[PDB]
Ligand binder design. Structure first.
Ligand SMILES: NC(=O)C1=CN([C@@H]2O[C@H](COP(=O)(O)OP(=O)(O)OC[C@H]3O[C@@H](n4cnc5c(N)ncnc54)[C@H](O)[C@@H]3O)[C@@H](O)[C@H]2O)C=CC1
Ligand SMILES: Cc1cc2nc3c(=O)[nH]c(=O)nc-3n(C[C@H](O)[C@H](O)[C@H](O)COP(=O)(O)O)c2cc1C
Ligand code: SF4
Ligand code: SF4
Ligand code: SF4
Ligand code: SF4
Ligand code: SF4
Ligand code: FES
Ligand code: FES
Lengths: 209, 216, 112, 121, 114, 457, 125, 78
């Protein structure tokens, strides 16, 4: 049945077992995110949605922390803001300076949430430079610029679970982890066009457009 | 780094057929038996190991054969194979020199061992010999730090090394003969202080049965 | 430094002043708002002549200079337009803002 | 650039993010001024604890007391301290920076004595 | 003064159709269209400035992230009919080619202050 | 005084391999003497002996082991049908840690009996021992011993005749240090890439194959049969309160004789070193610092490490931890910054790359450490680096990020003057450096950066 | 109910209230972004006219228009307010009721549920 | 602004006719010259625009090297 908890002072009632981010959304509190999506499995790899709950010592992933009776949640603590800035700082470290040429520009979540929660400037000026990633050909519909991938696995989650096209996945480990097919294979499904909308950054893009 | 893209060449190509030898087959049955019947995809790692034993390296044909055998989509097998570093996706040769260069190793001369190997074999750590006969590799901790200077060939550890001794080990390997199975030019039996045993100097071990909790 | 911090004591003073004004004309003043150094009085359209006279003419206020008059179109409200009056008191070096409301057919009393 | 704003190691942007620490606009209607008159203020309370305080807040927020009755019940201490000044005089229109004028005369003036234009400092 | 579209030393255009100049222009003077060039580059296929709407504010020049649109110091281009004042891509590139040296003077002088 | 453990009190005599690992030799040691009656006794008795013992996970977590196995048995455990499971973390990979290798190679049967005993405590149907892959020969050793145990009938469908079913298998991981994490371990066993899951759900509620499972270090399971036989109070007698028992202490680095021994907990450093490893190479004056526990733990300075104690508590008090008790000593001849940079390279190579903080932060830490190793940096970049560590610490999915952040913080806390001297060496010696290692004529030309050293090309 | 023509005191052309249809709606959650900040206001904009919407000038290639409302769009705080405004102006309107995401409970642990039968699909993470 | 850091006088007429206003303007010339000189003598160093790139655009040398600055520039001008 429906349980009760408080989020930023408010009182919000939600079905038991739901994720904390569903409660926040229901209560009118905005939480940043990238990897979470309403139609996809929960992933919790972007770490953007951190919040503080009094029981936990460290901030918790809001998309994957189940709600419990009497839970007290603060989304506006100094620690939370510092956490969002830290996460964004790390996210943009290897992101290419491609906005004037990225099709996502003007409707990019990385832009909007960097502007809303990130720092005004950057600290990364390394003479070794950034990481770069090969581009991958996955058919005539979805153009790929994989330098921009932030590894949210929305594309993988959708292609596997929703459309049943398991050719998409993540290869390698650590920094060199690449989304792709590991060999030249088209993303062949009649629903492929949707990874264009799911990819929060311009990594996957409409090719005829 | 980690290469995470496969590019088809005439060798290491999907059309190349790879099948398990009958002994390797029976072994594969035996290894799949260990996991629950519905969860038999858990056996991909041992099966890929078997493939890399039968054939020199983990080729795309091996990955696809394993994927067919466990009725998994080959992309999952690709993710597994590329995630684990002990999977060798390029061909190598008969002996695979693996220097440990984590801090305990360097604190006792793994740079000297590394130089000795590189002088004997001009090749860089990633490269292999033009004879294919040796392949070098810089590796993280191999789990024997008590013998800080140490190395592995294919499966055997060789520890407490010396540059003047690493060269000699190398030429013994080059001739074809294996000098010693023991880790070192014998100075210790593999874990005790060089000054000999300081404890456990008893001719026979004490039975635990002499000490009883009375709880039974 | 946060630039709003310099206004704190003055915001308190404006609050006290607005409290006095409401207490003085409870028949007219529907409410006030205070933002840094700008005080606003909200009045109904019928209250404009009395409140403007009190502002212009009371010894403690003396808002002798009309600065501007304008309207702001809020299409969500039942009364679209809100009419704004800004006054200036050269005697006291202070400003005040007075709001009313109107519609496309109900007029406001002129303060000419 | 200016220190500490250009520092690479100790400035989190949210500590110097002045746009989003902006002062809210404080709206006071007659009910709120009532509540201030009866129940006092956070700085100097005139309210009882427990359910009594909450119910007093409630019935003022419902309309139990009007503003005029509020003023009538209001004692001498509260009127003088919290509506007028402690001396009973009304408060003067506040000024942010009071300016004290001085008139410059003689040689330091802009124009000599005859002209109808004076120098205020 | 008048507008001109710049090239890279290699002679490839600098404008990559990012359309920030189009978005910032306070007079809505600029009209741009784009698509994948045959060699795969992101380039413009139409770039017009209506010189009779422009207010010569120089925002378009502050905006462009590759210094492609610039404003020359040229003021002597008065025309006898209005249709000559509707610059298309070809005209603006020709202006860039013609004024590149003076543009380099102004850039060398002011770039540290932008 | 703590230390100087009696040879009779030593847990396993076979550390030194003189007696042998044969099943008959283990019988001589007394293993499997009383398994029938131990199994017969109720699981509550096993877990309660553990609670009396105060056993805490010596993999490094330290979460109380008795309570941990308690969570495996919820009140309505009977309702949740399906196989309960147990898992053993044989995947030691912590740089400096060789204890578990000694445990599996020297005393294999103790692990299998402890697996059965703990599984009885947790009502597990089967066990999986997850061995790292470079560990081949002792994987064979363990498999031989497990075969002996099957053939004797002590492990199997009829365990010692008690009617309690147990199967024990060997799973080999293949070169991924993140798989040591319990949840990455469970995933790798399941047949995926070893990317940890998020907790909650904890392994007990949802674990291996979706079934309730528990992941435990090998030596904490290994000590369990001897603990049960000899009693909890005897085990508590050794080591101070809440830090009780005797642990393996692999010792490596710049000591005169590197060693592997077992010893009472809460022994002093100085005594441990000089008694077991012939002392620091060059004597106690020649000591720069010591890393108590493996690479994941902040390094100790010379002055404070003289009086420090080897329990969890004292090391946590001096702002470090026991970890896997893999002490690494560094003498004054060696460079500390080179060692810490190598640890950072290790963590960069070891991140699974799932969560953005770890994935993008380990590489930043490596890039900064190279420049500090050459000195190609400004002195404020030290404080910048500290904040970079704090970007990672609390925000990752698993504790690999914590481990990545910690060694650098220890380095900054203790050896910042060394970094400052090396930066002066870069400035006077080579040139003036801006933030991130750029220099006056450092530019980009025809695809590369020319004009500057570029550390870590 | 609806103000007829010729007692509107706005002075707008009669054609606006005679043969034009406005539409009132809430903006849909964009599929490209997860943010929802634009979706709460009630927009009001005019349905296009066939002949006068947009043509191409035969000189510089621009988008000519004869519809003077093609760019106008009002914002309202609520559906009833928009209805009242359109009625007070005499505009024929249509309401497009918004669509929202149906709530469902999402558990991270659901990714690891034990399967008693054959696996329907290999989740991968 | 910096009207509190600089010294100047304010001319005030008395008859309120065209001639007084002319005198006032003519003396405001002088006061403006005084203020200009003071600012010429006291111009300090530092930034000229507020140093938060969420309000004012970043310098072009950052915009072409730094990711955050490029994002903020893009958004500010779009
Ligand atoms: N053994 C090795 O080679 C290495 C081990 N480590 C050690 O790992 C430690 C951190 O590991 P973590 O997994 O992050 O530790 P942790 O503090 O999260 O504890 C891990 C265990 O806690 C148990 N647990 C805690 N609360 C529970 C609850 N409410 N219900 C059920 N189970 C619960 C879990 O079952 C889990 O296995 C460090 O202290 C480090 O020293 C790290 C590096 C190497
Ligand atoms: C990166 C990483 C590696 C780990 N490696 C091991 C390991 O090799 N062996 C181990 O027993 N625990 C390891 N752990 C910790 C275990 O996952 C788990 O938390 C616990 O310590 C093992 O159970 P136990 O110590 O209570 O017996 C590791 C944790 C992390 C984050
Ligand atoms: S994906 Fe977004 S942040 Fe990255 S370049 Fe494109 S618009 Fe900019
Ligand atoms: S391509 Fe897009 S959706 Fe896929 S992992 Fe990268 S950022 Fe996420
Ligand atoms: S100068 Fe101003 S009006 Fe002209 S094109 Fe540039 S931004 Fe637009
Ligand atoms: S801003 Fe510059 S680069 Fe972008 S479209 Fe305009 S001229 Fe081209
Ligand atoms: S912290 Fe590092 S190792 Fe752990 S899940 Fe995240 S990326 Fe992988
Ligand atoms: S949205 Fe929750 S961690 Fe990614
Ligand atoms: S440091 Fe080389 S094996 Fe451990």
């Amino acid at each position: 049945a429906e349980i009760e908890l408080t989020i930023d002072g408010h009182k919000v009632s939600i079905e038991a077992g739901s994720a904390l981010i569903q409660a926040c959304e229901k209560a009118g509190v905005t939480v940043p995110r990238y990897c979470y999506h309403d139609k996809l499995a929960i992933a919790g790899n972007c770490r953007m949605c951190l919040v503080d709950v009094e029981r936990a010592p460290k901030p918790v992933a809001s998309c994957a922390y189940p709600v419990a009776p009497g839970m007290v949640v603060r989304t506006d603590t100094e620690r939370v803001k510092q956490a969002r800035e830290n996460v964004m700082e790390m996210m943009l470290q290897n992101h290419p300076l491609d906005c004037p040429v990225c099709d996502q520009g003007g409707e990019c979540d990385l832009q909007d949430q960097s502007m809303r929660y990130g720092r005004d400037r950057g600290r990364f000026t390394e003479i070794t430079g950034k990481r770069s990633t090969e581009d991958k050909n996955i058919g005539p519909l979805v153009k790929t610029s994989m330098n921009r991938c932030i590894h949210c696995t929305r594309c993988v989650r959708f292609a596997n679970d929703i459309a049943g096209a398991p050719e998409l996945g993540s290869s390698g480990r650590g920094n060199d982890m690449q989304i792709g097919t590991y060999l030249e294979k088209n993303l062949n499904t009649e629903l492929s066009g949707n990874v264009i909308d799911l990819c929060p950054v311009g990594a996957l893009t409409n090719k005829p457009y | 780094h980690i290469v995470s893209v496969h590019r088809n060449t005439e060798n290491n190509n999907p059309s190349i057929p790879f099948e398990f030898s009958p002994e390797n087959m029976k072994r594969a049955e035996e290894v799949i038996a260990k996991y629950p019947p519905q969860y038999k995809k858990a056996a991909v790692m041992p099966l890929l190991d078997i493939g890399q034993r039968q054939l020199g390296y983990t080729s795309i044909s091996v990955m696809n054969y394993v994927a067919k055998l466990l009725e998994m989509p080959p992309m999952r097998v690709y993710e597994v194979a590329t995630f684990y570093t002990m999977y060798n996706r390029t061909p190598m040769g008969r002996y695979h020199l693996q220097i440990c260069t984590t801090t305990p190793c360097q604190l006792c001369g793994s740079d000297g061992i590394m130089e000795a190997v590189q002088n004997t074999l001009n090749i860089k750590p990633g490269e292999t010999t033009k004879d294919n006969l040796f392949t070098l590799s810089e590796v993280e901790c191999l789990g024997a730090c008590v013998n800080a200077p140490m190395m592995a060939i294919n499966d055997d550890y060789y520890e407490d090394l010396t540059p003047e001794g690493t060269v000699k080990l190398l030429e013994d390997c080059k001739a074809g003969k294996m000098p010693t199975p023991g880790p070192e030019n014998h100075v210790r039996r593999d874990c005790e202080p060089a000054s000999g045993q300081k404890v456990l100097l008893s001719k026979e071990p004490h039975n635990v049965a002499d000490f009883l909790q009375e709880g039974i | 430094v946060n630039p709003a911090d310099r206004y704190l004591q003055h915001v308190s003073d404006l609050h006290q002043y607005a409290k006095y004004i409401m207490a003085a004309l409870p028949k007219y003043i529907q409410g006030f708002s205070v933002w840094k150094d700008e005080l606003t009085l909200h009045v109904a359209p019928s209250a404009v002549i009395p409140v403007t006279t009190f502002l212009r003419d009371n010894t403690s206020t003396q808002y002798k200079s009309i600065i501007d008059i304008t309207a702001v179109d809020y299409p969500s409200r039942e009364n679209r337009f809100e009419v704004v009056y800004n006054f200036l008191s050269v005697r006291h070096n202070s400003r005040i803002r007075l709001k009313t409301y109107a519609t496309e057919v109900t007029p406001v009393p002129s303060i000419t | 650039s200016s220190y500490p704003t250009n520092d690479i190691a100790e400035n989190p942007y949210w500590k110097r993010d002045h746009r989003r620490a902006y002062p809210q606009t404080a709206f006071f209607d007659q009910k709120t001024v009532t509540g201030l008159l009866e129940l006092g203020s956070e700085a100097t309370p005139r309210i009882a604890d427990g359910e009594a305080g909450t119910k007093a807040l409630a019935n003022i927020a419902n309309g139990g007391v009007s503003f005029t009755q509020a003023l009538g019940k209001s004692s001498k201490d509260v009127i003088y301290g919290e509506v007028l000044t402690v001396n009973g005089l009304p408060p003067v229109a506040p000024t942010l920076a009071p300016k004290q004028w001085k008139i410059i005369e003689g040689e330091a003036a802009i124009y000599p004595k005859g002209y109808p234009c004076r120098t205020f400092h | 003064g008048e507008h001109a579209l710049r090239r890279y030393p290699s002679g490839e255009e600098r404008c990559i159709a990012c359309k920030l100049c189009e978005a910032i222009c306070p007079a809505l003077a600029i009209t741009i269209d784009a698509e994948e060039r045959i060699d795969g580059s992101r380039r413009t296929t139409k770039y017009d400035i209506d010189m009779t709407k422009c207010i010569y504010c120089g925002y378009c020049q502050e905006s462009c992230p590759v210094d492609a649109i610039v404003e020359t110091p040229n003021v002597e281009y008065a025309t006898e009919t209005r249709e000559e004042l509707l610059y298309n891509k070809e005209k603006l590139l020709a202006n860039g080619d013609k004024w590149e040296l003076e543009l380099q003077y102004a850039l060398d002088a002011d770039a540290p202050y932008r | 005084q703590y230390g100087g453990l009696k040879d009779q009190d030593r847990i396993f005599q076979n550390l030194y391999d003189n007696y042998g690992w044969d099943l008959a030799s283990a019988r001589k040691q007394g293993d499997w003497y009383k398994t029938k009656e131990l199994i017969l006794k109720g699981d509550t008795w096993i877990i309660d002996e553990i609670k009396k013992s105060g056993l805490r996970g010596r993999g490094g977590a330290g979460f109380p082991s008795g309570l941990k196995w308690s969570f495996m048995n919820p009140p309505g455990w009977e309702k949740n049908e399906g196989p309960r499971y147990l898992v053993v973390n044989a995947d030691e990979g912590e740089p400096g840690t060789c204890k578990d290798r000694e445990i599996m190679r020297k005393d294999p049967h103790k692990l299998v009996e402890g697996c059965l005993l703990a599984g009885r405590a947790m009502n597990a149907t089967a066990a999986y021992i997850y061995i790292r892959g470079e560990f081949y020969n002792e994987a064979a050793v363990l498999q031989t011993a497990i075969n002996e145990a099957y053939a004797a009938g002590l492990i199997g469908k009829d365990a010692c005749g008690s009617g309690y079913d147990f199967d024990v298998y060997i799973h080999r991981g293949m070169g991924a240090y993140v798989c040591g994490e319990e949840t990455s371990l469970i995933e790798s066993l399941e047949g995926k890439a070893g990317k940890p899951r998020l907790k909650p759900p904890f392994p007990a509620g949802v674990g291996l194959f979706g079934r309730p499972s528990t992941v435990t270090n090998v030596e904490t399971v290994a000590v369990a049969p001897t603990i049960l036989r000899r009693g909890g109070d005897w085990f508590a007698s050794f080591g101070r309160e809440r830090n009780s028992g005797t642990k393996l202490f692999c010792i490596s680095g710049n000591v005169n004789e590197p060693c592997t021994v077992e010893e009472e907990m809460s022994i002093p450093l100085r005594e441990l070193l000089e008694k077991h490893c012939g002392g620091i190479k060059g004597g106690w004056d020649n000591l720069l610092g010591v890393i108590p526990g493996g690479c994941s733990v902040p390094i100790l300075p010379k002055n404070i490490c003289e009086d420090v104690l080897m329990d969890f508590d004292a090391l946590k008090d001096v702002q470090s931890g026991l970890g896997t008790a893999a002490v690494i000593v560094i003498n004054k001849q060696q460079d500390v910054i080179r060692a810490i940079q190598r640890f950072a390279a290790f963590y960069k190579h070891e991140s699974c790359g799932q969560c953005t903080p770890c994935r993008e932060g380990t590489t930043w830490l490596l890039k900064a450490m190279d420049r500090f190793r050459t000195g190609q940096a400004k002195e404020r970049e030290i404080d910048m680096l500290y904040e970079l560590t704090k970007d990672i610490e609390g925000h990752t999915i698993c504790a690999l990020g914590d481990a990545a952040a910690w060694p650098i913080q220890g380095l900054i806390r203790n050896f910042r003057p060394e970094m400052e001297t090396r930066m002066k060496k870069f400035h006077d010696e080579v040139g003036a450096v801006s933030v991130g290692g750029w220099m006056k004529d450092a530019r980009v030309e025809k695809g590369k950066v020319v004009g500057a050293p570029l550390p870590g090309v | 109910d609806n103000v007829p023509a010729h007692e509107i005191v706005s002075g707008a052309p009669a054609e606006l209230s005679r043969n034009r249809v406005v539409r009132i709606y809430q903006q849909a959650k964009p599929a490209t972004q997860s943010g929802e900040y634009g979706t709460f206001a009630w927009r009001l904009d005019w349905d296009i006219v066939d002949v006068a919407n947009r043509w191409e000038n035969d000189l510089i290639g621009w988008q000519s228009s004869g519809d003077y409302m093609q760019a106008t769009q009002m914002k309202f705080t609520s559906k009833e307010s928009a209805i009242k405004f359109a009625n007070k102006q005499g505009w024929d309107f249509y309401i497009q009721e918004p669509h929202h995401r149906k709530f469902r409970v999402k558990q991270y642990a659901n990714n690891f549920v034990h399967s008693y039968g054959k696996l329907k699909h290999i989740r991968t993470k | 602004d910096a009207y509190d850091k600089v010294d100047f006088d304010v001319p005030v007429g008395m008859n309120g006719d065209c001639y007084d206003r002319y005198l006032i303007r003519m003396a405001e010339f002088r006061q403006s010259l005084r203020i200009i000189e003071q600012c010429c003598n006291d111009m300090p160093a530092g930034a000229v625009k507020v140093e938060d790139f969420k309000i004012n655009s970043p310098p072009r040398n950052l915009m072409k090297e730094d990711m955050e600055a490029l994002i903020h520039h893009f958004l500010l001008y779009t």
